[PDB]
């Protein structure tokens, strides 16, 4: 009995087996329709296909393309029979209960899994760090979440969602590079811009000081080799693109920065657990992979929080796959074997058992 762990993100689906330290299959969470194509095949045939994202802001909105994504994951990507593997799934914070019920119904009736579990992505990220209490900033590709978790339970009254993630940062980087004369308007240009964002962008400790240094000197300018032999230089955009996380007004967003949303989440919690949340600030997701984001978050939260408070920001190097890592840790636990919603339990109780067993 090998457990399947499948973290379905807005931009990337990361699937694999429990006990592994890395998602064996990380592919774009896109479905191409002209029969349909899912993942890298749909991305390659971008022109011939119409691409749709079944998951937006971490919430599944199109269940048909979600079924196609899961079928491709089980058969075309992991190459396993779903009926012989208990499949642990992941869900977004504050996910609608109807979505969880549909998830379990599709897992059990369409794929005939013997068992399944649904866990909140931020809680799995916290599990990957060995914590049950703490605040997690899970910024993936479509949404950012500030999720305080007390003893494995994500407090619904203090979770906030910020519609600002890697997609917005990539679009902002495209806009700035266009402001410099670099034409990035096509999907392939979007992908290479995302590559530059991943490889060169970083979070500045002091945005104004970094801007002044970029204006004065050229030490912050880095060279990048475009696919068509061109070489382009990027200067102050290396820290301007991630700064939208802390200054959303860069793209016209009226919301607050990730540090301010973190402080607001901690303030929405009881004063007795605020110390635990402050001391356990866990970074999770691809959009948290910028260099210097942990130091900047620590500095900004220290500014916002009371002076005597102890603030610790936890940003593991594998925080891009921390959700899947926590899911794999969960599904490979001996005490977790009884939390699997079994086919018998689903048959005797219906999909609503997901609220009673996965909570």
């Amino acid at each position: 009995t090998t457990a399947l762990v499948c973290d379905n993100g807005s931009g990337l689906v990361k699937a694999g087996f429990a006990g592994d330290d890395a998602p064996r299959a990380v592919f774009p969470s896109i479905v191409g329709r002209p029969d349909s194509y899912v993942g890298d095949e749909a991305q390659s045939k971008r022109g011939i296909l119409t691409l749709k994202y079944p998951i937006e802001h971490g919430i599944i909105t199109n269940w048909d393309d979600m079924e196609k994504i899961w079928h491709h994951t089980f058969y075309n990507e992991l190459r396993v029979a779903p009926e012989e593997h208990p499949t642990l799934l992941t869900e977004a914070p504050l996910n609608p209960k109807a979505n969880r019920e549909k998830m379990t119904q599709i897992m059990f009736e369409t794929f005939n899994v013997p068992a399944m579990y649904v866990a909140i992505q931020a809680v799995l990220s916290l599990y990957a760090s060995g914590r049950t209490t703490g605040i997690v900033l899970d910024s993936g590709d479509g949404v950012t979440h500030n999720v305080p978790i007390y003893e494995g339970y994500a407090l619904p009254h203090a979770i906030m969602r910020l519609d600002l993630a890697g997609r917005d940062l990539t679009d902002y980087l495209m806009k700035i590079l266009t402001e410099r004369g670099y034409s990035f308007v096509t999907t392939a240009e979007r992908e290479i811009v995302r590559d530059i964002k991943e490889k060169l962008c970083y979070v500045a400790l002091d945005f104004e000081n970094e801007m002044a240094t970029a204006a004065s000197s050229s030490s912050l300018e880095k060279s990048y080799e475009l696919p068509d032999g061109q070489v382009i230089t990027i200067g102050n955009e290396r820290f301007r693109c991630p700064e939208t996380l802390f200054q959303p007004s860069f793209i016209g967003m009226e919301s607050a920065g990730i540090h301010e949303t973190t402080y607001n989440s901690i303030m929405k919690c009881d004063i007795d657990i605020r110390k635990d949340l402050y001391a356990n600030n866990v970074m999770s997701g691809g959009t948290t992979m910028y260099p210097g984001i942990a130091d900047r978050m620590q500095k900004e939260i220290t500014a916002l929080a009371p002076s005597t408070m102890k603030i610790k920001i936890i940003a593991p190097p594998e925080r891009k796959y921390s959700v899947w890592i926590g899911g794999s840790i969960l599904a490979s636990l001996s005490t977790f074997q009884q939390m699997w919603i079994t086919k018998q339990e689903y048959d005797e109780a219906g999909p609503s058992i997901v609220h009673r067993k996965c909570f």
């Binding site: 060995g130 003893e151 339970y153 657990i273 939390m339």
Partner: protein
């Protein structure tokens, strides 16, 4: 040990297991093992009745007696472990998560009973009695009560009587001097949990309520003989219910105005059931605080002199809330045990 026995034994290893936790877990195990017996439903009904009245000692004794009567089908070692765990459990007034969950569900069930076959005449007469009790400085815009919403609104508006009309009843009371609530004004805290469930406690995804602010109330630990300290099985949402003395005053006016009513006892019990449902569901009080106000010696004398037998909102069909609280108990206990194992695994991994 089979899978079910192993799951039960692991759940009983929960460090924060209390008497309610233990009762729910062992009743679930006994239903899954000996439930096929013809006499089991009577035992389950008696255990649920004991649990609703917080007769935890009697419920645990009955459960242990049944386990010893079926020591062969269950197992001598398993029964010995259950007996050992039975004497090791206690109750924390600040932390009774299974009890708070069960009381929220039971308040919802009380409301469901109330709405079915709802008699508006009882609460119209209660509103009339309220008008002849409340002082002149308290307004009452509920001219007539026609729906359950208006009756609940009147029940909740009975709070304007405090410190004016019930002072005599509180003075005559012997238990209200044992009320232990901190005078400190701690403000309000956010929650998505219903009723008297604590804000940080885990909850079913379909059981959460829209986020709202609720008053933060602490125990007066310096009080000698405090109600919470004396009765730890009672979940502390507040101390003894002082507004229920105002309700008793209004009910005294109700009874003196309807001494010839043949169904007076039924109407008074209906009013008490609505009061308990509203106070548990709104998070103002737990069941036993209100009920123990109703069980005061002089309040009991008041209700006995009117030939009224209070059932204290006790119902005989609590199977759904009992089983849902069992599921909640199992979830909390298994999750805590898995959290222990996961913390150990990640710590050993790094």
């Amino acid at each position: 040990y089979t899978k079910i026995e192993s799951s039960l034994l692991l759940a009983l290893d929960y460090p924060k297991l209390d008497e309610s936790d233990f009762i729910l877990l062992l009743t679930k195990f006994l239903e899954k093992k000996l439930g096929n017996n013809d006499n089991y439903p009577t035992f389950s009904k008696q255990i649920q009745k004991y649990y609703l009245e917080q007769e935890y000692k009697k419920a645990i004794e009955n459960i242990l007696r049944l386990c010893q009567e079926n020591e062969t089908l269950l197992g001598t070692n398993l029964v010995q472990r259950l007996i050992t765990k039975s004497s090791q459990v206690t109750s924390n007034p600040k932390d009774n998560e299974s009890r708070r969950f069960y009381e929220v569900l039971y308040a919802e069930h009380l409301e469901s009973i109330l709405r079915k076959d709802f008699d508006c005449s009882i609460f119209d007469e209660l509103n009339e009695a309220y008008n002849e009790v409340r002082p002149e400085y308290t307004v009452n815009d509920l001219t007539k009560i026609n729906t359950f919403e208006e009756a609940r609104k009147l029940i909740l508006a009975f709070v304007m009587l405090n410190d004016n009309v019930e002072l005599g009843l509180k003075a005559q009371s012997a238990i209200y001097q044992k009320k232990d609530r901190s005078r400190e004004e701690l403000g309000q805290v956010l929650t998505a949990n219903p009723g008297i469930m604590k804000p940080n406690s885990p909850n079913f995804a379909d059981n959460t309520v829209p986020i709202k602010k609720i008053d933060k109330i602490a125990i007066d630990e310096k009080k000698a003989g405090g109600y919470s300290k004396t009765n730890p099985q009672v979940p502390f949402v507040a101390s003894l219910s002082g507004t229920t003395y105002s309700l008793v005053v209004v009910l005294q006016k109700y009874m003196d105005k309807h001494k010839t009513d043949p169904n007076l006892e039924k109407k008074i019990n209906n009013i008490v059931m609505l009061w308990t449902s509203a106070y548990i569901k709104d998070g103002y009080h737990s069941y036993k605080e209100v009920i123990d106000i109703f069980k005061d010696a002089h309040i009991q004398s008041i209700f006995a002199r009117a030939n009224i037998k209070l059932d204290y909102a006790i119902i005989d069909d609590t199977d759904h809330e009992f089983h849902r609280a069992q599921e909640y108990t199992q979830g909390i206990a298994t999750k805590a045990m898995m959290h222990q194992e996961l913390v150990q695994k990640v710590q050993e991994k790094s």
